[PDB]
Design a protein around this ligand. Sequence first.
Ligand SMILES: [Zn+2]
Ligand SMILES: [Zn+2]
Lengths: 606, 607
Amino acid sequence: MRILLCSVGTSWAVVPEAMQLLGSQGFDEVHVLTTASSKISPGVEQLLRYFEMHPGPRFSISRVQDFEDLRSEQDHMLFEEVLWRWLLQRAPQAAHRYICLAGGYKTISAAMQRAAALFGACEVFHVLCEPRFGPASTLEEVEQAIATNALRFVRLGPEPGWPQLRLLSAPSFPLESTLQGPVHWVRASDMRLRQHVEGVLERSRHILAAWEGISELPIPALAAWPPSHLRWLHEPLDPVQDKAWVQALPKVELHCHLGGFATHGELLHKVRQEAANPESLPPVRAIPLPPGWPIPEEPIGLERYMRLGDNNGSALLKDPGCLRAQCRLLYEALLADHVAYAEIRCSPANYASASRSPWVVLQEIRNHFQQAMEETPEDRRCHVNLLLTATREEGGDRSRIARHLALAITAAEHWKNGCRVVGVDLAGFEDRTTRAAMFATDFEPVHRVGLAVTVHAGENDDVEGIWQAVFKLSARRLGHALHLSRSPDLLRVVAERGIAVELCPYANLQIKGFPLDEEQEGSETYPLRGYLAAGVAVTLNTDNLGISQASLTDNLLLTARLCPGITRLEVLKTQVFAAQAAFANQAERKALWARLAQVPVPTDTE
Amino acid sequence: MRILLCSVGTSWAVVPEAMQLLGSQGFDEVHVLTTASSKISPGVEQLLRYFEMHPGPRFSISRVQDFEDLRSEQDHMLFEEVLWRWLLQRAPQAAHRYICLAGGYKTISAAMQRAAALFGACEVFHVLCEPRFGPASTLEEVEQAIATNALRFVRLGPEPGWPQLRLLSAPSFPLESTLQGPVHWVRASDMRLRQHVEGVLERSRHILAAWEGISELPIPALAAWPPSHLRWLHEPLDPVQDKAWVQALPKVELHCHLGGFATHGELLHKVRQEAANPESLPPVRAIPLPPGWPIPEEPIGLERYMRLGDNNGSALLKDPGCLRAQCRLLYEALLADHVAYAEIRCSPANYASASRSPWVVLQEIRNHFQQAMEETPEDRRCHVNLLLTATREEGGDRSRIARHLALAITAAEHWKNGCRVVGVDLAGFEDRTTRAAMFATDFEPVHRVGLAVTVHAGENDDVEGIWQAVFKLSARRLGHALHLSRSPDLLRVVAERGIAVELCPYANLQIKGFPLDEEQEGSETYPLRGYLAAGVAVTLNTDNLGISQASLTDNLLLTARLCPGITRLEVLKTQVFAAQAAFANQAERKALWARLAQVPVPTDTEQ
Ligand SMILES: [Zn+2]
Ligand SMILES: [Zn+2]
């Protein structure tokens, strides 16, 4: 197959001369684009007459409707778009597409070659004839010109096109044609093809501009962003102007307690009113929040923080209806926060009763979350995985811990799809009596069945606890752990081994307290920026959605006030770190990475 | 500023009409490019007169030498080069470009728009004049056209250009311009600008084509490869045809023993001749290699493999000259194999004498490697780091282990640059009563000082040892972990925790005897492909360059015979895994990544 596409102007003789580029071999078919002007109807009929007395290849003299003369830029734009559709329709394959530049206006030939470059062409050429004819314009003059070898062919060279423009097909952008005899009259209903081409070229420019430095982008899909947007990422995050952008971000939640979600306000009452046994509901205790909540004047400490959530949890979630409401409302909050992957921490043995074993509670929690996931479309679905919290308490009791670890080992094998149990969370009481090595023997069965481990080291400013968690419990993640910089060896080990650090900005500020909205960083600042500079995989989390009274968006924005000059690219980097640190399998991680590629487009850049 | 660029054919009147695109303000500069045809000279004179009157803006008429008539493709390509260089020189800034395509041939106008789209242009426009003049071609007709508003402008739209094409400058691609009055006659010395532009567009097409599957490429620089080369990457590796390509690869070595390098032959002889005390050299023991070496008919086992290296090691490297020769020759072998990063395992206490403490020996080893490194250019330098091997022994002897661990702890903080000690290797004799957990107490200081641990599983078919290495010794890498698949939980843990598996193809074949050139798979194959499919970070190493008689290239090519249908992209993946698993710091890792981005170009991508 060899198809020749040739525009024609007043000089109809260009097409028969362009027919002779390949010599006696000729073209399998030639298709001619034409305008609607009346100055070229004699040329069109002469072309038809020449085609009649040189038959064998397919012929088309398709004329562009509503295009008489170049009045303004709109005529050129319409002609270009109709050219693109006609080129797709008549020469679907660029491997054998021959394009002639002779006919038409100067802009017509320039658009001919521009379309050749955009979509690809086997050869782009121009035909010239020596001016030694007349008393070629007529049939006999053209025949004499070809017989006497009076044709010059300048081949501008083959055009490879563009990778994502060569796959465009005629059905995607159809060209409506009205027959007026042996001549087609073509028109276009819209400018879809031109808009698609311009968007493609803009994206190609963005990718090629961001190509040098793609390894520094946490999300590779960001290379298609405009350079202004990429410069916007490296700017410091603005906590008030980036509310919408952070809100729309697909986020990863790795440290969220189920029992600390609907602890006060309207959510607590919504959970309570769904109880299956309202007469067994405990009275709502008066738990006054510290003034300025969620940003207290003075840090309140771990004891007061945990007491703030006394209205929900073991007291409330022993009711099956309260538990179901808690799970469904937590999933609704996750969907409202655009969380794409979440790991929820629960204590099923804390909610067990005489007739409801901890396995029953865990199965109910998992099924509630699975039903919530299934009721949600794939595009905006939040995948929820379960971590079981092994709480260590002052006193030495270890039977609830044994129940929780055994429950995790059983559930890790039970559910292989959907909501899964993916790890254990060693949490509870901070002291040198309840450090990691004390429970290092308890977690050998957890390591045998390939269950991941995360460890709270929140309150105790004890480097030894973090070291024991990393090396005696084989913890893959560390909860809080705000004093890694105290031991440079420990910080280097955490960064080298890929152990993720779960930071909870609002909860850390409420419990510990950090300098806020400071222009300079030193000796007291939130360690997020230093951890990132040290190569630590840092994740930002909510800890307790209810007690802290802040969502994931609020925590991400509070990182702007906690760390001076933290860039929003660093927010994306924390999201990527959390995606990598998730206790997810290959399918879950693939879905999460597909979700993370859809970074919201910023507004009011520069 | 606003600079106008125009072409002139037989109708010189296009330029005066094009000067009125903006209106009464006009353009600050009006530059004219045309050919050397004799039919243009009257038009050039008319344009010169029209530039003499209205002396407002700056003018320049450029005539293209060596171009008279559009005869063939050579004329068009020469004109294109003159156009590109003239556009770069006259209008350096794309935001100040107003390119008119009214004049010249059809190809000239098409080249006008092509150059505008390539290097960027603030406006591309065409001017049309009504035919109601004449009996505009003369000065009076042109003036009447300007006054009576008979011109139409078709502004094709601004051209952004290409990001790496609009940064080009005139000095890089100058024009040979000669003056014949007020007219410039310009010509191009060669075709350099076209070659640069074609290379840029070809690379851009390659990047955009591979943009979709860029997350599937272990090295991001591979997206600039031609699509045929990337389809070649996914084809199975050919041990015979891909020899040169694998040899040219920048490689990472993570499992290479210093004492098993010059164990026989010319290298052993050279290490012996470099002895400082030749009279104290032990006699060369008669150690016949198994037939078919390096590929024996049957596996020989770990005992025979270790006995193959009896001519070197402790018995020979106690001599300072022999040690220096061994280190320098090992570095030269690493350079000849294009290894970019290496971790050499040594046992300094094995080579210590009465007057030479293990610290002296380790310092000498480190200084020899650092001197070898410093004498190599940075672009070719192989960074060498040292791992100290704590060899486990039956009978409970643990003084040498204590010495090696203490030596590693001291040396880890001693050297912060160049060659440095970065970890410990737990090797030796693996039996049920030598398992990893037996030594968890010994390695607490190593974890305290943040030294990485690799566990050297050897002569065993046990998964409990691997489990204890992972969870009791906190091993970051595992050597010869050829039985991970037998425990699915252990394989999942190894893949999930990012624990690298150090595979030594030739050594594993020689010690355990995996099948070669088998049809597809099954119950005996080298577990490399199975590990890769399970998400395990797999690295391919030499183990002992001397005992195995194989370089890193030889092992990489042997993986093609060991694992049927393994793709060379998986070889690149193993290199990336070794780079990620190295016990390197930020600077070493950055240099290693820079060296890995230079993947050799394939040669046989024609099928
Ligand atoms: Zn917590
Ligand atoms: Zn070895």
